[PDB]
């Protein structure tokens, strides 16, 4: 979708699109475990 928007901006700002172009030309040549459960924050102290 950037292409048309680049047509709106012109030639000076073609640099800022570089990693978009690399996101495109590269695409032209181209077990699950739960993370962040927060159970690590749990505590158990017997001395209480």
């Amino acid at each position: 979708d950037f292409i048309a928007e680049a047509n709106a901006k012109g030639w000076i700002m073609a640099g800022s699109y570089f990693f978009d172009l690399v996101k495109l030309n590269g695409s032209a040549t181209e077990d699950q475990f739960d993370t962040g459960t927060g159970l690590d924050k749990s505590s158990f102290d017997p001395t209480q």
Binding site: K9, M13, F19
Partner: protein
Amino acid sequence: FAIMILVNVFLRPSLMIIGYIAAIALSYVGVWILNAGFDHAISYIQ
């Protein structure tokens, strides 16, 4: 050998002022140029 120097020292101050105020404009638009695309050059990077 007197010509090229004589005009130089004659015009150096004026031209400096020519390059002062004009430059004050350019640096201005400089920031704007950055603000024209920075948020898009940092898009995937953020």
